[PDB]
């Protein structure tokens, strides 16, 4: 079993000062095996924090990230699953399904993770799985009407991934779970 934290669009410190305290309390160092970050940290402070949580941290370049050297996209394999990672500001219209499906095929991944919209998504489409963790800080963006903080945790064993979404609803954390199987 491999636990994979998925998060991004924190926008610390220009839009938000910190991760929500109850999210931070959930992330105990050593518990999680892999971290996949969609970008827009936007400073080294947040990268240092993720490195205190896990030994394998991946991050792609957001459109506000100070570190322009983060790769623009990444493919990581965890167990039986090949996973694609991109921030998503490059896709116009934002979140466009046909464009994300084209990315899925070109990366040749079972799961495609993107961000940028600050809207959590977790869904299957033509026998592939698509995840957007939303914004872990609830950072505003150009469009949306104030944002619920969220992050995702993938629980991977054999050919099954159980995707958990954590949301800060008012002042309390609530969860939802979705199962996916490699066909």
């Amino acid at each position: 079993r491999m636990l994979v934290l998925v998060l991004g669009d924190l926008h610390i410190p220009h839009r938000c000062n910190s991760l929500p305290a109850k999210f931070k309390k959930l992330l105990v160092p050593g518990k999680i095996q892999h971290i996949l970050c969609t970008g827009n940290l936007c400073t080294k402070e947040s990268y240092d924090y993720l490195k205190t949580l896990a030994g394998d941290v991946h991050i792609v370049r957001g459109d506000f990230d100070e570190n322009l050297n983060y790769p623009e996209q990444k493919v990581v394999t965890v167990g039986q699953f090949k996973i694609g990672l991109i921030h998503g500001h490059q896709v116009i219209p934002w979140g466009d399904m046909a464009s994300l499906a084209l990315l899925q095929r070109q990366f040749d991944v079972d799961i495609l993770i993107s961000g940028h919209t600050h809207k959590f998504e977790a869904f299957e489409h033509e026998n592939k799985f698509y995840i957007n963790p939303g914004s872990a800080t609830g950072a505003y963006n150009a469009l949306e009407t104030n944002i619920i903080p969220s992050f995702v945790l993938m629980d991977i064993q054999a050919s099954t991934v159980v995707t958990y979404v954590y949301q800060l609803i008012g002042d309390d954390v609530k969860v939802e779970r979705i199962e996916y199987k490699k066909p």
Partner: peptide, 15 residues
């Protein structure tokens, strides 16, 4: 356990 986002119940989670 944590409460579910939608509905009334609770869900076990890995953290």
């Amino acid at each position: 356990y944590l409460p579910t986002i939608t509905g009334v119940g609770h869900l076990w989670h890995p953290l």
